[PDB]
Design a protein around this ligand. Structure first.
Ligand code: HEM
Ligand code: A1BZE
Length: 438
């Protein structure tokens, strides 16, 4: 009853889109079994995301914190909603995402991208179907594990299948917790719970190896794990460390994979844009196998294509803030203690904010084009924006540039362009393609 006065009805994000269009900038919805208010004016996005006064609503992150009674991300960087506790860990972990830190990762990005392209080139017979979703997820995982933890997962070589299965089931668990046959319930619970335990045990094992390497005086390059450890200096137990281990293990590859998959999917029906991209990579990097850091800024058209991919297909569709006190938002009285839902997915597909919103047009992000003002936020905005944004943008440019340099992709007929909402948004189908060398 406290929300019944708010406009509203008498993937789920498309239903929200329809309702925002019909009912306006402030609409009551039910999401993850709780009443929320979707706020879609740019004035609101600015007000709430650009102030440290407004913090995340913990209740809407419960499925990341713990699933079926197993601690998952716990109080790591994404799911910690207390400002002071978040701030302390953010400032320490930020050191691993410095300009100098990120420049040193180019070798890893290049090596894993080159490995992917070589594997794909051997299958480029115009006939063999290849799941680009799977290949790009393995590439993202292998990049993350090496870059962040000094670990070789070698998923591109077909290694670590138990780990890959663990990740899949954990993501299914997050999804089931936020939605949802007795025999079905039993096996599901068992497999999800054991997968989460496996992931934290991977953390424990790798932290032990790192500590042992340091004690023996071995060479350990400073990385994300260094700063995750530094954040926990003098903690009473290792649960905080393992929260962030798992947070970065998953966050550091899943969304990047989703974004790569969506971009490959969309480009399969954009032959003219693909031709322009091919020309750009040919002109900027030539025959070089390796992209230098300075080359990345020169791939201007690719940058624009990637921005446009995130407008229509943001893997993380939005964020929540807790409204503590009753507040008038765009003419609507919103009671205190209410989760406010912000969605870059919904705003990206609204004609009020983007002309011909379903048209894929990289020119929207061109040098002379007016920039979206608080209508576009695939990495979010403000203090709780993505710590990995520049890491992600670099890795995906490296991977895409090397694909475009060497291969042509055709989507297998019957493959769909639709989305599914699991723990993130991702393509519904495996992005099955046939390949030829350029
Ligand atoms: C295209 C790739 C990526 C997209 C679209 C993306 C998107 C986002 C979004 C929308 C948020 C805000 C989430 C929220 O408010 O609940 C976020 C936060 C975060 N992301 Fe990313 N992300 C990407 C890549 C990465 C990578 C590569 C890493 C780590 C290496 C990463 C680690 C994080 C962490 C730790 C947070 C929490 C930040 C904080 O609250 O201080 N993400 N991401
Ligand atoms: O679950 C998330 C969320 C947000 N960010 C992430 C990331 C992430 C960020 N950067 C890299 O990865 C990874 C995942 C994971 F499932 F893959 F683990 C989930 N999330 N939520 C958003 C939208 C609905 C829900 C609650 O509100 C805010």
């Amino acid at each position: 009853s406290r929300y019944e006065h708010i406009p509203g009805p008498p993937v789920l994000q498309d239903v929200f889109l329809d309702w925002a269009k019909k009912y306006g900038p402030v609409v009551r919805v039910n999401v993850f079994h709780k009443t929320s208010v979707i706020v879609t004016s740019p004035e609101s996005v600015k007000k709430f995301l650009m102030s440290t006064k407004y913090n995340k609503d913990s209740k809407m992150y419960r499925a990341l914190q713990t699933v079926f009674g197993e601690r998952l991300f716990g109080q790591g960087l994404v799911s910690e909603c207390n400002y002071e506790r978040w701030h302390k860990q953010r400032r320490v972990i930020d050191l691993a995402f410095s300009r100098s830190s990120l420049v040193s990762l180019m070798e890893t990005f290049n090596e894993k991208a080159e490995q992917l392209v070589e594997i794909l080139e051997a299958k480029a017979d115009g006939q063999t179907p290849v799941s680009m979703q799977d290949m790009l997820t393995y590439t993202a995982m292998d990049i993350l594990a090496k870059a962040a933890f000094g670990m070789e997962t070698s998923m591109l070589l077909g290694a670590q299948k138990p780990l890959s299965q663990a990740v899949k089931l954990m993501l299914e668990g997050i999804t089931a917790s936020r939605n949802t046959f007795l025999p079905g319930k039993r096996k599901q619970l068992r497999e999800v719970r054991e997968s989460i335990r496996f992931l934290r045990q991977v953390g424990r094992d790798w932290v032990q190896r790192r500590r042992e390497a340091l004690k023996r005086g071995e060479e350990v390059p400073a990385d994300i794990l260094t700063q995750i450890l530094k954040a926990e200096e003098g903690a009473q137990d290792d649960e905080g460390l393992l929260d962030n281990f798992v947070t970065f293990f998953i966050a550091g590859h899943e969304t990047s994979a989703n974004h790569l998959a969506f971009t490959v999917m969309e480009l399969s029906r954009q032959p003219e844009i693909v031709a322009r991209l091919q020309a750009e990579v040919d002109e900027v990097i030539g025959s070089k196998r390796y992209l230098d850091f300075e080359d990345l800024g020169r791939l201007q058209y690719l940058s624009q294509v990637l921005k446009e991919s995130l407008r229509l297909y943001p893997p993380a569709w939005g964020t929540f803030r807790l409204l503590e006190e009753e507040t008038l938002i765009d003419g609507v009285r919103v009671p205190g203690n209410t989760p406010l839902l912000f969605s870059t997915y919904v705003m990206g597909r609204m004609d009020t904010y983007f002309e011909d919103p379903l048209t894929f047009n990289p020119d929207r992000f061109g040098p002379g084009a007016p920039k979206p003002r608080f209508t576009y936020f695939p990495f979010s905005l403000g203090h709780r924006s993505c710590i990995g944004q520049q890491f992600a943008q670099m890795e995906v440019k490296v991977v895409m540039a090397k694909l475009l340099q060497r291969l042509e992709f055709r989507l297998v007929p019957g493959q769909r362009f639709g989305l599914q909402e699991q723990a993130t948004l991702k393509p519904l189908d495996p992005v099955l393609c046939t390949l030829r060398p350029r």
